[PDB]
């Protein structure tokens, strides 16, 4: 079978300033898939306050392998914000491609400050909607 090697997935999370989760809180983005068959599945996972204290003044963003059939997945990705003018910023990229296994997420602890994202001369938040936008390429 064919695969699907390469994949933008892109989330809007609503009314963004209103989340409630606290620090080591994760909102879980709905499972994407790619690979033979639809068989590797993939998540993203915004912590809107952070891991930890060390990053509680950042949103946190990380790419999770969900599922997959055998061992591992090599990958490389990168996440960015689309702008009020649906551009890319705020971009950030695998340094090369990562060993992903099931369970396991690589990504982003300090990925964007919250008071720069909240700042609406910033235009991140146009009508308080947050639009991440995540570029996956599955070398192995």
Known sequence: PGKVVK?????????????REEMGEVIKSSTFSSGANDK??????????????ESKDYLSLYLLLVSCPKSEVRAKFKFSILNAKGEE???????????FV???????????????????????????????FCEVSVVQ
């Open 7 to 19: 994949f933008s997935y892109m989330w809007t999370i609503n009314n963004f300033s209103f989340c």
């Open 102 to 132: 099931q369970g396991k997420d690589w990504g982003f602890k300090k990925f964007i400050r919250r008071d720069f994202l909240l700042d609406e001369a910033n235009g991140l938040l146009p009508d308080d909607k947050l639009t991440l």
């Open 40 to 53: 590797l599945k993939w998540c993203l996972r915004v912590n809107p306050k952070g891991l930890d204290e």
């Open 89 to 99: 910023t705020k971009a950030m990229e695998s340094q090369r491609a990562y060993r």
